[PDB]
């Protein structure tokens, strides 16, 4: 175990269920550095905040196609990516900086190879 390799960190087009009636979807820029999630609207604002807490992720689990699903302790979010191979790493980047912040958590799939 304790394995570690690069890419903990991710941004790039998503988009946000602002609504919830599953009515429509609204595009937002979303960056990762280790600690929390930090995602601002495509259009320039002013006075406005949206942070997620890394703390705040209780579990990550995938949704319809190339979607997936982030339970938050004060409100579950949903990100869409644009390609496979995203929707994949974004979770893993989670989950992995998830098992840092919390020991012995619980486990999502373990793949000891190196080179």
Known sequence: GSSGSSGKVK???LDKLSP???RMFQKRWVKFDGLSISYYNNEKEMYSKG???LSAIS???VQGDNKFEVVTTQRTF???VEKEEERNDWISILLNALKSQSLTSQSQASGPSSG
């Open 20 to 22: 919830q009636g599953k």
């Open 78 to 80: 949903v990100f869409r």
């Open 11 to 13: 941004s790039g087009w």
């Open 59 to 61: 579990t990550v689990r």
């Open 51 to 53: 942070i997620i807490p």
